[PDB]
Write an enzyme that holds these catalytic residues in place. Structure first.
Site, PDB file in Angstrom:
ATOM      1  N   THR F  45       0.856  -1.193   0.000  1.00  0.00           N
ATOM      2  CA  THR F  45       0.000   0.000   0.000  1.00  0.00           C
ATOM      3  C   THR F  45       0.898   1.251   0.000  1.00  0.00           C
ATOM      4  OG1 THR F  45      -0.366  -0.127   2.418  1.00  0.00           O
ATOM      5  CG2 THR F  45      -1.939  -1.279   0.969  1.00  0.00           C
ATOM      6  N   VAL F  47       0.888   4.566   2.597  1.00  0.00           N
ATOM      7  CA  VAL F  47       1.438   5.186   3.794  1.00  0.00           C
ATOM      8  C   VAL F  47       2.341   4.184   4.498  1.00  0.00           C
ATOM      9  CG1 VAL F  47       0.914   6.199   6.048  1.00  0.00           C
ATOM     10  CG2 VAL F  47      -0.562   6.693   4.088  1.00  0.00           C
ATOM     11  N   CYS F  48       1.932   2.917   4.502  1.00  0.00           N
ATOM     12  CA  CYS F  48       2.651   1.857   5.208  1.00  0.00           C
ATOM     13  C   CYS F  48       4.132   1.725   4.832  1.00  0.00           C
ATOM     14  CB  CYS F  48       1.937   0.520   5.026  1.00  0.00           C
ATOM     15  SG  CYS F  48       0.135   0.633   5.221  1.00  0.00           S
ATOM     16  N   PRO F  49       4.466   1.633   3.524  1.00  0.00           N
ATOM     17  CA  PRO F  49       5.892   1.582   3.206  1.00  0.00           C
ATOM     18  C   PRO F  49       6.658   2.781   3.728  1.00  0.00           C
ATOM     19  CG  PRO F  49       4.600   2.004   1.233  1.00  0.00           C
ATOM     20  CD  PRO F  49       3.633   1.622   2.311  1.00  0.00           C
TER      21      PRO F  49
END
Lengths: 195, 195, 195, 195, 195, 195, 195, 195
Positions: F45, F47-49
């Site tokens: 996804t 924001v997660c990275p």
């Protein structure tokens, strides 16, 4: 719970203008205090400002006898504030020592029984309400005649006198005037005195 | 007809004591005149006699402005007379300049909305009714506090003033005090006069 | 409805001595008056008569502020009267200016939570009840220590003072002494005044 | 244990402010001493500081009759300290000769039956608790009326008198005032003397 | 309603200090606005005054982004004011540009899942409630570590950026730094640019 | 155990990617060390990275203060690796200096109160668990706004400072800024210095 | 739900054309986003293509403020697609940057109150629905007059301005023009500036 | 008769302020003319005076196309006049070229379906009504966002263009922009021209 003497005053709630700022006011907010809830038809009219200023100029005398005074009409609280910021000389109120309650939905006037549904505005009703939310006095005038602030205060002082002395108040009673012990035998010393 | 301001006064009929003598009165006897119709709880009590004598003593001032005064209660007319034949000095009424109406069936008090149903007696209710039977003012006090005869007279002259002159009466209006031309432009005349 | 401050006082009914005559009394009879309802264990004892004659001797001062005093115990009204007809020199009451209520069933004491069920007599319980039947103050002593009449009167006058002036009463408040406007800014007036 | 006269006072523990430092207090700490345990609604209010400073300025007299005085409320011990550090002129307490106990959890007020649950604060409850932890007396005021420190002290002196003399105290008893031997024959000595 | 993210914030009502006066606030009062609702254990403590003065100093920057800031604790509103009238030099607050809400009944803290029942005080909980009024972020520290006002404002600004731009905010995002179009193809722009 | 502050962190076990190989981690593996346990919705996804690379880039600074960092999501450990072998330029992670824990059964997220059952993925929850292993701080953002790694490290450092110094950390505290001795007298040093 | 301002928008579901492909979408699909849901009567007509092309040329600017744009009519998704593949010169649409929703059963048009039942086609209704599915603006024109795409973009930006700045938007407001703080004292800054 | 496009506009009658003068208005005063009837919530607010002054400054462009503009709200016609007499600098209207209609009974707002029964005021409703009393356009805004005076004018001219010439107006049509003959063969002329 009805707008009639000896009954509990109907619950009301509205946004008021208190001391120049908006504030919500509930009937519960006056538990423990006397209250002169009085209705007027419209902001920016003719009799209404004369009554509102008259009560405001005597507000300290009411507060000194544990009595609040709130004026109520169907206009917005913005109209109330605008009318407060109008000078008396130009039909306005000026700085106010009493609360001004907005009854914008008209539901307070309807529950107090003083709304003319056809016009959409309150008659000149006044209610003196004791600390336990019970109605002690009420009076309604038609629109063209203003109320007596002096008489309203005389009545509040009188209802307090009977509850703290246990004598009843004659017609035209003022403080320091004679009163009656409400027993047939003891009521005589009054009747002797004034005749 | 309703016991509310702006509405027609409910019809009433009963036996009265006028001038030491029994006589029938109805609402229709007062068409053309103003009427102060005021209720009191009971004969031979305490606040009641002080109010009746005060109105009796000021009746010439009501008559001079085309206003009649009638006291009403649930007692008989035989009670009314016996109370007239009691000296004031001993809690009575003495000679009377106003009618004392008997409401023996209680229907008048009930129709005027001032009957405490459980006790069978009227509150201190007062109505000002104009020449056409329309109620211009009403007021109700609880039992322990008497009314003002002065304020009743003030209010009567106030309603007469607005009829005669087309102007409205401010708060605390006395005869000769200023009044307000009830148009936005013409009203400034008043507000400038007092600020 | 419970024997607790801020709550409505329990209904009571019983036979009492009033001017040496048997007479019924309920809580309803004191609607409109303040009521000092004080329980005491037993007739013909020791502390009890000193309290009753203390309250009787100051009874006029209570009546001057719309307050009835009613002494209550679990003896019959026939004992109350016998105790009235004993002279004070011999541990009796003599002439009385207050009502002596018989709680023969013990229900009144039990409803006011001052009954010692084990012995079948009440503790030295005092309740101050306003015109509205609401408890403003309660107070209980163990049996060997009598109460102060001066302090009870002090509390009646203080609860009356706040209800008619809207200010709160300090500790050791007496008539004429200072009081506090119960708002943060407004209360400094009091604190400046006494430091 | 229950909050009632003749019963054992309920156990309490909490943090108090004693002589400016924080310190745990328990009911255990007062075994062997008399204890005036008094509740007040809130810190930084109006009647409460007047009651607390009146108790504090008389604490010497309580201490001289082996009696401790402990004020209690629902505020933190940090509010307590901050209020001690406010001058009396400014509504504060100043130096305290009595402990101020913090009932932060509201449990102590609830256990002593004086918590108004709706508002989360305590009525004006006072308990006189003896050296064996039994309640000899209890008074409760509604919020606007303060208590009498004078009377609280009269009651402690009175309970101590009966314990160490075996004579019961009349109404309005003060030290060095006549008291009653509580048997029928022996009691006549009192009743003859005071009449 | 529940105190969790994506859910509607629990309803709350209570008395708050707003510009040195006692106002009434509820969750309805903030409909249309972002609300930062933060809890703190007790007035007159150590980390708490530092948190409240930090927010009050940056209060303008929250108002400029349609956000109100409300401090909450289990203390009375009278303590909140006393603390407002303590100078910052002496562990106090000084003049305030945020509301200080009284959770005197402890209900609000309980409802928001932050009340330590044992001690009767709140943890350092913080809730960013959106305009209708869903919780977007919550955080809780233990008692001895104060929060970052800077990060709180970063988050209000991030949640407002995503509502009005449809891009998502990276880790450590600040106003003007890059953002991500949340689509597999569109996001490639962000990732290429910053690596 | 429960996912709340002051309470022991719930037990969890699962397969994690640690240096490109499948290891097994549990809450027992971190006894003796501070753990930052943070949840994210899904691999691959947006924001997660950005969150994971931010922590992995500052991972050394957490290790230097005895702190491990563990990312958690509902993805398989085989996805975690695939994402590790995707370059950062192309939305990937690259080489990792933190663990990536697989919550494939969804149990850990459920146990830590962050699983959205409806969609079957975690919110942006973060937990700073101390060395034994009590939760000191938790935070939860909604999905489209990434967290601050800087603030997370500030908080681990603050909680470590208070354990080893016995002073409390103000709002916005950073290593070397002033702190407060949590005693009323001792705290005066802090407040005088910064005002 | 209902098709009125301040209400929740009615749920809809249907086959839409997105990038020349059939794809079901619903009101749910736009949770988190602004939506401009506009109805037009019929494919292959006259005003309708000029509305759809105007929005589709401006759609970049709507997506840049987190706003989707959806055209809806009672035609099939096969007509919608056929109209896309007609050139603009020839009465068609060309490549589309907005969704075209088929309301083949007419139920979406019925629920939004825009369906002329007699003809079985929609009036020119437009709705601005916010991120929580609440209607902020609606407008309907009769069939022969097209709507302004510019004015629709202005309002979306206006409704976003008030949620992120807390000030209200005057008549004819455009981005970077003056706005009003909606308190009475703070509003003067605006009224003085523009006059 | 209903507040919907293609239907006849509901009848209204009320007192309006016209050229500083009170004067009754009704729907049928505007027969033969286009009417722009626009509702606003309350006198003395913020967005409302901006719309009213904007329309009044363009009133002559409306009058030249035989269109009237009437502003409506639930305030008294007296408030309208006090607000006309407030200068624009101080949040007022000054001189007006349009009628301000009073809806003191709220019936007009209820009949046009723009009244919020809860709060007692109108939403920002706007209606274009043709010479036969048929509604051609309506639009409602939520309270914080003002309308576009230019777009109202654009639409009045648009609706005249179609009655005069029998051609339909495209999106964003301005006076002298191309229009469409509503026939398949003829409409081609418009599409060839604008591409």
């Amino acid at each position: 719970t009805a707008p009639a003497v000896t009954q509990h005053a109907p619950y009301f709630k509205g946004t008021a203008v208190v001391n120049g700022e908006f504030k919500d006011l509930s009937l519960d907010d006056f538990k423990g205090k006397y209250l002169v809830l009085f209705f007027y038809p419209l902001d920016f009219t003719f009799v209404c400002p004369t009554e509102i200023v008259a009560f405001s100029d005597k507000a300290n005398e009411f507060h000194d006898v544990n009595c609040e005074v709130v004026a109520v009409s169907v206009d917005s609280h913005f109209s109330h504030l605008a009318w407060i910021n109008t000078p008396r000389k130009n039909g306005g109120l000026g700085h106010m020592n009493i609360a001004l309650l907005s009854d914008l939905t008209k539901q307070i006037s309807r529950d107090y029984g003083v709304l003319l549904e056809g016009s959409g505005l309150a008659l000149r009703g006044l209610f003196i309400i004791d600390p336990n939310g019970v109605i002690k006095h009420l009076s309604v005038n038609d629109l063209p005649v203003g109320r007596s602030v002096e008489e309203t205060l005389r009545l509040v002082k009188a209802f307090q006198y009977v509850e703290t002395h246990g004598e009843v108040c004659p017609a035209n009673w003022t403080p320091d005037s004679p009163t009656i012990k409400p027993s047939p035998a003891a009521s005589k010393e009054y009747f002797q005195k004034v005749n």
